[PDB]
Amino acid sequence: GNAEKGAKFLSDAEIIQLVNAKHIPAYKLETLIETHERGVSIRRQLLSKKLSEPSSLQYLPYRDYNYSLVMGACCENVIGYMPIPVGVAGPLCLDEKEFQVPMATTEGCLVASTNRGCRAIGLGGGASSRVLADGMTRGPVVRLPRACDSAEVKAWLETSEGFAVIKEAFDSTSRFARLQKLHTSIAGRNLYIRFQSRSGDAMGMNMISKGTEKALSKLHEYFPEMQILAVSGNYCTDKKPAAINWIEGRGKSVVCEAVIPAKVVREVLKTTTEAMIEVNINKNLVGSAMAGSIGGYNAHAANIVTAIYIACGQDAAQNVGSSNCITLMEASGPTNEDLYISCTMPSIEIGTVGGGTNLLPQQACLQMLGVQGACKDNPGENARQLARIVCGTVMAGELSLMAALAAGHLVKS
Amino acid sequence: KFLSDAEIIQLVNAKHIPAYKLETLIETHERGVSIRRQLLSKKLSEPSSLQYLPYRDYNYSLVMGACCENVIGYMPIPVGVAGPLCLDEKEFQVPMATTEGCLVASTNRGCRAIGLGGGASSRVLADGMTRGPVVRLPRACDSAEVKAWLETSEGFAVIKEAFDSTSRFARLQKLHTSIAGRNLYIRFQSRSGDAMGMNMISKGTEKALSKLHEYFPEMQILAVSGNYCTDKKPAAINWIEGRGKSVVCEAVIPAKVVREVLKTTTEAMIEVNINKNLVGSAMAGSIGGYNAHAANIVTAIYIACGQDAAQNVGSSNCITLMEASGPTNEDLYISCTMPSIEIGTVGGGTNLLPQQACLQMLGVQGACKDNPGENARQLARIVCGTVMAGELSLMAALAAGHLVKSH
Amino acid sequence: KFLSDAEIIQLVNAKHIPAYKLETLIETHERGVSIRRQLLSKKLSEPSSLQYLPYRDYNYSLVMGACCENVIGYMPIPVGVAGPLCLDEKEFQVPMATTEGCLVASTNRGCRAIGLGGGASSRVLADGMTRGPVVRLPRACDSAEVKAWLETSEGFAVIKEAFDSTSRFARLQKLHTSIAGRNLYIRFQSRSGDAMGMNMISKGTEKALSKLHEYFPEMQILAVSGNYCTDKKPAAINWIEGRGKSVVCEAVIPAKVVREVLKTTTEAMIEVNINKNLVGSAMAGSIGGYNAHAANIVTAIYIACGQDAAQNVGSSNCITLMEASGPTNEDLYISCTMPSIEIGTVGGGTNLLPQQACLQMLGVQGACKDNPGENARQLARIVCGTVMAGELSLMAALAAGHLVK
Amino acid sequence: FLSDAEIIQLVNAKHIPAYKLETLIETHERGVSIRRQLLSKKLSEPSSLQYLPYRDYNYSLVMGACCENVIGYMPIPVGVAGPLCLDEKEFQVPMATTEGCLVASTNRGCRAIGLGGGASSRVLADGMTRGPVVRLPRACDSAEVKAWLETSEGFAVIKEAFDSTSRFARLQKLHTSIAGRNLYIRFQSRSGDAMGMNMISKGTEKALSKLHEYFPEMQILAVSGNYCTDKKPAAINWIEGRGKSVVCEAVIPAKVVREVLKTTTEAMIEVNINKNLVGSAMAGSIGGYNAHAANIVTAIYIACGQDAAQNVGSSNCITLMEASGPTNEDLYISCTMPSIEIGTVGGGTNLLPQQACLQMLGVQGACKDNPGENARQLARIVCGTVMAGELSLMAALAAGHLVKS
Numbered sequence A: 001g002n003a004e005k006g007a008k009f010l011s012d013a014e015i016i017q018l019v020n021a022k023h024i025p026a027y028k029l030e031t032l033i034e035t036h037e038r039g040v041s042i043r044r045q046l047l048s049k050k051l052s053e054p055s056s057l058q059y060l061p062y063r064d065y066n067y068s069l070v071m072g073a074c075c076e077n078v079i080g081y082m083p084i085p086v087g088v089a090g091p092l093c094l095d096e097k098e099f100q101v102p103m104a105t106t107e108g109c110l111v112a113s114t115n116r117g118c119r120a121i122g123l124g125g126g127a128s129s130r131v132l133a134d135g136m137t138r139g140p141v142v143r144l145p146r147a148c149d150s151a152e153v154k155a156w157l158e159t160s161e162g163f164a165v166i167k168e169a170f171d172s173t174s175r176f177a178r179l180q181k182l183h184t185s186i187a188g189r190n191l192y193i194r195f196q197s198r199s200g201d202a203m204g205m206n207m208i209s210k211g212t213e214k215a216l217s218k219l220h221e222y223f224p225e226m227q228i229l230a231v232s233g234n235y236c237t238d239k240k241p242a243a244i245n246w247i248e249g250r251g252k253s254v255v256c257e258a259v260i261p262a263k264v265v266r267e268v269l270k271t272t273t274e275a276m277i278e279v280n281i282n283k284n285l286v287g288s289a290m291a292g293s294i295g296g297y298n299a300h301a302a303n304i305v306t307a308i309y310i311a312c313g314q315d316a317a318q319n320v321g322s323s324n325c326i327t328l329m330e331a332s333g334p335t336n337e338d339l340y341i342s343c344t345m346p347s348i349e350i351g352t353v354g355g356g357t358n359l360l361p362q363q364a365c366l367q368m369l370g371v372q373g374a375c376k377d378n379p380g381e382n383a384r385q386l387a388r389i390v391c392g393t394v395m396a397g398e399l400s401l402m403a404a405l406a407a408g409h410l411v412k413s
Numbered sequence B: 001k002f003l004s005d006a007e008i009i010q011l012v013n014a015k016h017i018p019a020y021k022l023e024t025l026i027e028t029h030e031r032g033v034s035i036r037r038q039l040l041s042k043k044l045s046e047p048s049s050l051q052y053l054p055y056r057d058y059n060y061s062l063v064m065g066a067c068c069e070n071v072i073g074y075m076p077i078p079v080g081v082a083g084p085l086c087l088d089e090k091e092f093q094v095p096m097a098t099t100e101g102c103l104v105a106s107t108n109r110g111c112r113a114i115g116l117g118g119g120a121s122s123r124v125l126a127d128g129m130t131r132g133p134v135v136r137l138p139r140a141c142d143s144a145e146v147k148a149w150l151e152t153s154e155g156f157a158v159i160k161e162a163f164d165s166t167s168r169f170a171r172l173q174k175l176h177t178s179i180a181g182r183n184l185y186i187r188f189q190s191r192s193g194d195a196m197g198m199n200m201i202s203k204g205t206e207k208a209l210s211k212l213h214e215y216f217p218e219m220q221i222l223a224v225s226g227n228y229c230t231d232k233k234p235a236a237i238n239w240i241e242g243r244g245k246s247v248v249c250e251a252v253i254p255a256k257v258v259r260e261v262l263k264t265t266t267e268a269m270i271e272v273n274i275n276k277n278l279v280g281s282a283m284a285g286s287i288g289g290y291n292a293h294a295a296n297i298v299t300a301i302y303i304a305c306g307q308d309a310a311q312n313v314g315s316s317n318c319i320t321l322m323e324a325s326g327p328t329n330e331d332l333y334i335s336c337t338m339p340s341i342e343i344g345t346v347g348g349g350t351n352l353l354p355q356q357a358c359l360q361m362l363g364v365q366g367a368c369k370d371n372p373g374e375n376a377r378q379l380a381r382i383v384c385g386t387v388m389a390g391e392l393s394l395m396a397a398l399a400a401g402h403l404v405k406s407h
Numbered sequence C: 001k002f003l004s005d006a007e008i009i010q011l012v013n014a015k016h017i018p019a020y021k022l023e024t025l026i027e028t029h030e031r032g033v034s035i036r037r038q039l040l041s042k043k044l045s046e047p048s049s050l051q052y053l054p055y056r057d058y059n060y061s062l063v064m065g066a067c068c069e070n071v072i073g074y075m076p077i078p079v080g081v082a083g084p085l086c087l088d089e090k091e092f093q094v095p096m097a098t099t100e101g102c103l104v105a106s107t108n109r110g111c112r113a114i115g116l117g118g119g120a121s122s123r124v125l126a127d128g129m130t131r132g133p134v135v136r137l138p139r140a141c142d143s144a145e146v147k148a149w150l151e152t153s154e155g156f157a158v159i160k161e162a163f164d165s166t167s168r169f170a171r172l173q174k175l176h177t178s179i180a181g182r183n184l185y186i187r188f189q190s191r192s193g194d195a196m197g198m199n200m201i202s203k204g205t206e207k208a209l210s211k212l213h214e215y216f217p218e219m220q221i222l223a224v225s226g227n228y229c230t231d232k233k234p235a236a237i238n239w240i241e242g243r244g245k246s247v248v249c250e251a252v253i254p255a256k257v258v259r260e261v262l263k264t265t266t267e268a269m270i271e272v273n274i275n276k277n278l279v280g281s282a283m284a285g286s287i288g289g290y291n292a293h294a295a296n297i298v299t300a301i302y303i304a305c306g307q308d309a310a311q312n313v314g315s316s317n318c319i320t321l322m323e324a325s326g327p328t329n330e331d332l333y334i335s336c337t338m339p340s341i342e343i344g345t346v347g348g349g350t351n352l353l354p355q356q357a358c359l360q361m362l363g364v365q366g367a368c369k370d371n372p373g374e375n376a377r378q379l380a381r382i383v384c385g386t387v388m389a390g391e392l393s394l395m396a397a398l399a400a401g402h403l404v405k
Numbered sequence D: 001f002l003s004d005a006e007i008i009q010l011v012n013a014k015h016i017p018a019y020k021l022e023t024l025i026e027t028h029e030r031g032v033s034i035r036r037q038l039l040s041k042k043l044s045e046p047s048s049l050q051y052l053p054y055r056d057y058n059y060s061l062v063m064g065a066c067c068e069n070v071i072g073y074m075p076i077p078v079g080v081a082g083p084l085c086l087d088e089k090e091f092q093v094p095m096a097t098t099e100g101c102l103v104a105s106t107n108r109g110c111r112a113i114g115l116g117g118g119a120s121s122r123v124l125a126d127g128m129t130r131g132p133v134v135r136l137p138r139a140c141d142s143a144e145v146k147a148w149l150e151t152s153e154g155f156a157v158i159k160e161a162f163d164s165t166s167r168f169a170r171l172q173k174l175h176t177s178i179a180g181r182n183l184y185i186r187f188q189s190r191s192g193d194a195m196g197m198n199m200i201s202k203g204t205e206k207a208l209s210k211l212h213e214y215f216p217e218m219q220i221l222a223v224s225g226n227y228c229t230d231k232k233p234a235a236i237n238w239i240e241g242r243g244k245s246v247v248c249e250a251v252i253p254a255k256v257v258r259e260v261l262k263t264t265t266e267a268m269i270e271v272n273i274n275k276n277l278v279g280s281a282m283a284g285s286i287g288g289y290n291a292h293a294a295n296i297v298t299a300i301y302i303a304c305g306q307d308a309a310q311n312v313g314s315s316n317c318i319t320l321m322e323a324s325g326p327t328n329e330d331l332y333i334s335c336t337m338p339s340i341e342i343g344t345v346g347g348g349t350n351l352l353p354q355q356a357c358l359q360m361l362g363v364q365g366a367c368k369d370n371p372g373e374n375a376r377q378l379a380r381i382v383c384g385t386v387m388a389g390e391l392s393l394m395a396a397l398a399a400g401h402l403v404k405s
């Protein structure tokens, strides 16, 4: 019926009461209650009346979903989950292997197009890829009394011993923290330090923050007058467009290529190698340059990154820098009727452990590509492998869309 | 029809009927996906990989033929809620589909500071989706002529006529042209009701390019999209000219609220905003990213509300500014300007029911009958508002030395 | 007056006179300069380091109070000539004030290929100098309101009237506004006859900002220039929106001419242009610099013709493109598009006689009485033309493996 | 030797290239004197070079080194600003310009600094760069070369080759960048007191050869694939630096700001942020967070024989202003310039008048004892003077003193 005061289980009815009582704040329901799902039920209830159209929540799934794995490190105020259609494209004949690429999307033709692109590649002898570099970064802003002081610190960080003490501090942070280079940049009395380190099969944004922080402390011991303004002074750079990610790289840098047989271009892609190339240059090069792009000399690399990212538990917001990509197309073969295509992506921020990678459905798409979890034997291998697949699939998508654009097929589909 | 499950399998195999064909071949969407999963498993190095990828009893009737191909199931993204967001004297319960811990918590904490601050105000500065095809002429002198033509009032009128005759909402605004030798990049800009409009615009520019061709028969239409729109790629033009909805946001957090809720000082916030979001971003050579994590907020809301999560690229453009304010300058004045929010309230993933749930939750869902475009615009303002909230909280945490404490 | 350099210096050393005023006193420019050199030598660690800095017999008359302060002589810059430049069915002998060897030789070699190629064609795509002040309002909602106001036809009309009432040539074109919170950046665009117009425009935006103030009394005019013009700084907005004169250029070099004059192959040129001026520039994160050395050509012509050599920054923006052309695709099609050539044929260094010499040499000097702006525009085209010429030659040299040696 | 009208006809007939005139006439000046007559016919107005100087210049130092087809020289007013109290020294900075108030303003700025205890500067890095484009059959090959160049031994053989090129060629790091089967290699080396554009090209070329020995299938497309980057705007110069990177700072006493600069520290700062930061960002600038660093670079560059076209990358500069002092009434100002391409030897640095302005700053020629010192010292002066000019113009803008001066 109704009651009052904390006790045993109680009822949705008035457990709500104690929330108004302001002793059980909304987001703490899982703290108190016994079953995660009840918690979400009660919140959807609270939130329900907070709503203008309370009948909304009705078609928002939530029932039976392992929440023990989200509550804790993947989301707060869980009021359910969002279903994203997951299509599959492939096989992707990449580096003498075939992958069935999962793509969580809501945009029609994206999967169809990526597939059509994978096809051209398969009938083309397949594609080759190489991870050019690997390292997640973090660039805090630090301050000194005078620019002359910043200057001194910069020089110090650049001496071999100085770098060694910073590296030691940094690496003592984790099992995988192994500080590579150190890129410093001065702005008056400000000093931006770009820390770069590998991180096994983790995307490493977290590991690196812990590492730079410990390093900044040891750095402070030497320059007590230094102010650590913010672990992140946008010099990483994370989730924001930045020429530095494009030029210096961030995460995994990777190249991709394939040669599509003139026949395959006419048959599968429905155009000409000559037409493709004529479009790639004036679109992905001259066009992008005209729009003042930094890092976006590609057709829709983003569409492919986001889809794979959502499907495989990556940070869909890193879609920003991860999509950097220049796609190039040349005439090739004995008659120059064959299409040579490459795709270079300098900043693929990706990981195979932690984050959304810990959820089971996302993990399903990872296993589907045989990348899931940490690579015990060779640490970082899964992350790297996935990076290559992302780059490979992007080339596939680039191939198909570019073709469609050349052929005048975009409006039809 | 009935044929044993594996009977369809073998059948397809022996015919080599492309899996994607299924939906048409088989009766009932869930069969075709269940069968596809089945075919796929045998192509995998661990046939039981999809053991945890849901797919059962989902509404594929909407999806197939409109949102995704080769469906093999669906991906569950935790959906949190933040708010109320006291924006323009209203309160919104903002849904955020994410997998990053603290994002919702932080956006909430940010919304809180704003609520106890008298709320936030926002304005949509401009509205217009764009499409910029590449077109070619024999000589640059010809491109030149076309450019001048498109710039005459009559020339623009015939192009506009053609363009607008494309849809009920297609109303071509300006026309930005740009020459590269014999190449001509034409940026078409038009409103589009409550639709994000990427599709409507393509239809419009295409019809317009035809009418344009009638006048310059020697013109080659190389591609409806010559990257001058620009869509899903970083571009100074979206930042400077705007794309989609441009919107400003502001709020003033009372010094007490900054010390109590945000756990810092207005002075500290400002010292960080300038050297991070301004000097830092400039040092990294950013174009459009003078903000802390506008992207985190856009993506979350975008995924939760059926938007194109890949447009996260240009939609996240945002400059966040913080000034000292009040009688004592202890209050925090904060603003966030986002010039290119590509958003829509109709079509796309906006047609799926669960996404529609999050849209109703903000009372934006579907087309706005009375005032077309209103929902799209309203949602844009909410995205900008929530972004400011997130900016507030994260900036604070950074000032206070809390990122490696919260996470 | 007439005393003695020997003592006209003491008063000065009695600080009764600031070196930078000798002019006001000692009426006879060269003497003013003369005394100042002497007074400076003493302050120098090497009292005679100015031994070789010319100064005599230069017409400081026009310089003083309009081009330079604290004058102490002049700097001689070698002036070479390149051409003829067969541009738009005309031939120009282009003057280039430079100190870099081969620049003139190369630009010439480039002009040559063009002459034996049927010549080059050019078009001025747009014309308008800009000024973008920063203005402030109490709240962003206020900025917003002003933006919308400036965008209404009547609002623009009152702003335009105010702006145009500033000068005989001030004819405000569009108005590009941009909001940053409670800040509002207004880009004013207007023609300006044959003047580069940086000054004319400032005067115009200022009068306009006043009338704007009358309507929004709560608006703070922070600075007539809030870097949204943008002047003398790299900016995507100049590249995308244009600034000054925007112009295209093209020519087709006959395969024979490429092999003979330029010493390479159209195929090789093209292979280099794409991977250097496009893919390379993109790799370096360039905004506006998809060209080989457009700057070398702009600066030289700018110094020789009295332009603002510092505007070399935005004026050099240029994308140079090369395609295969002809019945056999062995001919080289080349184009050069420069969106922001800040140039003028009147005022500034354009008032000095030696610079004016180089202007007449191109028949552009002074204002074009009949068709105002024509000289400025014509010169802009020549700058673009000569740039293509230089692009042609250097690209070739690079293709052929000739830079070093 | 004999006669003029004759050399002409003789020329016109056997039609000799005007540019060869120097190798057929006893004195240079009669070469350029003939050249000039010879060109006058070819003008719409034969009497155009009337006022264009030429006599008694000493083309000797120019011929075959600084300029071709010389028809004379261009006089650029040279003003002086200072003293510049930089690093406990005072410099009298020469500025070759044609823009009124530039010198006056830079002076006024130097003044505020002098009465402020002076300015401090530091050279953060030194290295000229060259980035050729090289090609391989497949991207996998490019990839392999990149990794090779990154191994310590691979770098050692490349460095050896590179350094064996000159006495000052000492290859620092190596920044590589892949674009499919393309490979952009950024070579970085010091170069004494030379700007080093030439030395580096010779070095990368020698290195690219040795590189070829290891990857015979590699195509050297161009010694310069715009990844240096030279004379074009590029985020890489801004982020990685090019030439000399230097910081500058000073603190102007609140009194001095009100008295000399005619404003408030609070006003200055309010303008710097919304103009040089927020404004520049709104215009989509990469590298230009400053008011007019270019004006100062160009002037000093022309006066001291530097490459005025490098004005493009050399002008990169972010200027910052904070409140300082016991009451925060004092103005703290800094200026960071990451890519000052400068040199004190070779180029226009070999001409005597330019050398005059170099001595004036006591930088002229190579620094025997400490190689590179002069180049570096001049770089610091350029950065110092830029801060000075930033100070004055920013002030003027804050105070609303522009249009009228």
Ligand SMILES: CC(C)(COP(=O)([O-])OP(=O)([O-])OC[C@H]1O[C@@H](n2cnc3c(N)ncnc32)[C@H](O)[C@@H]1OP(=O)([O-])[O-])[C@@H](O)C(=O)NCCC(=O)NCCSC(=O)C[C@@](C)(O)CC(=O)[O-]
Residues within 6 Å of the ligand: A107, A108, A109, A110, A111, A112, A113, A114, A115, A116, A117, A119, A268, A269, A270, A299, A300, A303, A400, A401, A404, A409, A410, A413, B018, B020, B069, B070, B198, B225, B226, B227, B229, B230, B231, B232
């Ligand atoms: C629609 C297609 C794929 C047809 O392509 P098609 O060649 O005309 O159709 P087809 O039946 O003749 O070819 C068959 C092949 O297509 C594929 N295919 C065909 N249908 C399906 C399907 N249902 N499901 C899966 N795969 C499919 C499949 O791989 C198949 O191979 P096969 O079965 O013979 O072994 C093509 O025309 C295309 O790729 N169009 C463009 C797609 C695209 O651009 N997608 C992204 C959205 S565009 C956007 O919003 C970004 C943009 C444009 O703004 C960016 C920019 O500015 O550039």
Ligand SMILES: CC(C)(COP(=O)([O-])OP(=O)([O-])OC[C@H]1O[C@@H](n2cnc3c(N)ncnc32)[C@H](O)[C@@H]1OP(=O)([O-])[O-])[C@@H](O)C(=O)NCCC(=O)NCCSC(=O)C[C@@](C)(O)CC(=O)[O-]
Residues within 6 Å of the ligand: A025, A027, A076, A077, A205, A232, A233, A234, A236, A237, A238, A239, B101, B102, B103, B104, B105, B106, B107, B108, B109, B110, B112, B261, B262, B263, B292, B293, B296, B393, B394, B397, B402, B403, B406
């Ligand atoms: C974690 C907080 C929010 C704690 O916040 P707090 O103030 O330290 O502790 P609190 O308990 O006093 O705060 C409680 C209030 O915060 C919110 N809040 C608190 N806990 C919860 C919860 N469980 N669920 C929901 N809401 C929560 C909520 O609104 C609540 O209001 P109340 O009811 O108490 O008046 C804070 O420390 C914070 O915001 N940290 C930063 C979080 C963040 O920004 N993370 C994601 C972005 S990091 C990134 O990847 C981007 C980066 C850094 O790489 C980009 C760059 O800068 O380069």
Ligand SMILES: CC(C)(COP(=O)([O-])OP(=O)([O-])OC[C@H]1O[C@@H](n2cnc3c(N)ncnc32)[C@H](O)[C@@H]1OP(=O)([O-])[O-])[C@@H](O)C(=O)NCCC(=O)NCCSC(=O)C[C@@](C)(O)CC(=O)[O-]
Residues within 6 Å of the ligand: C101, C102, C103, C104, C105, C106, C107, C108, C109, C110, C112, C261, C262, C263, C292, C293, C296, C393, C394, C395, C397, C402, C403, D017, D019, D068, D069, D197, D224, D225, D226, D228, D229, D230, D231
């Ligand atoms: C050196 C040349 C011109 C030889 O040119 P050549 O074709 O090798 O020899 P040639 O004598 O047979 O050519 C003669 C023609 O060239 C011209 N020419 C030839 N000599 C002269 C002269 N003395 N004075 C005037 N004009 C001359 C002239 O027009 C003549 O026509 P002709 O009289 O026979 O009918 C050629 O090899 C060349 O162009 N070299 C490269 C020039 C160049 O581009 N350098 C300046 C930029 S380098 C820099 O600092 C920027 C950079 C490159 O680093 C930026 C980047 O890419 O990152």
Ligand SMILES: CC(C)(COP(=O)([O-])OP(=O)([O-])OC[C@H]1O[C@@H](n2cnc3c(N)ncnc32)[C@H](O)[C@@H]1OP(=O)([O-])[O-])[C@@H](O)C(=O)NCCC(=O)NCCSC(=O)C[C@@](C)(O)CC(=O)[O-]
Residues within 6 Å of the ligand: C018, C020, C069, C070, C198, C225, C226, C227, C229, C230, C231, C232, D100, D101, D102, D103, D104, D105, D106, D107, D108, D109, D111, D260, D261, D262, D291, D292, D295, D392, D393, D394, D396, D401, D402, D405
């Ligand atoms: C005009 C001034 C200098 C007057 O300065 P003032 O303080 O108004 O008047 P003052 O006579 O009392 O000042 C005297 C002091 O100024 C200097 N000074 C004064 N006159 C001279 C002179 N003739 N020659 C040399 N030095 C002079 C000198 O140092 C002297 O110190 P003192 O000897 O008294 O101890 C000042 O108002 C000013 O600096 N104006 C602005 C100058 C300027 O910056 N213009 C060039 C940039 S405009 C442009 O094209 C770039 C732009 C606008 O586009 C950049 C952007 O986009 O932001």
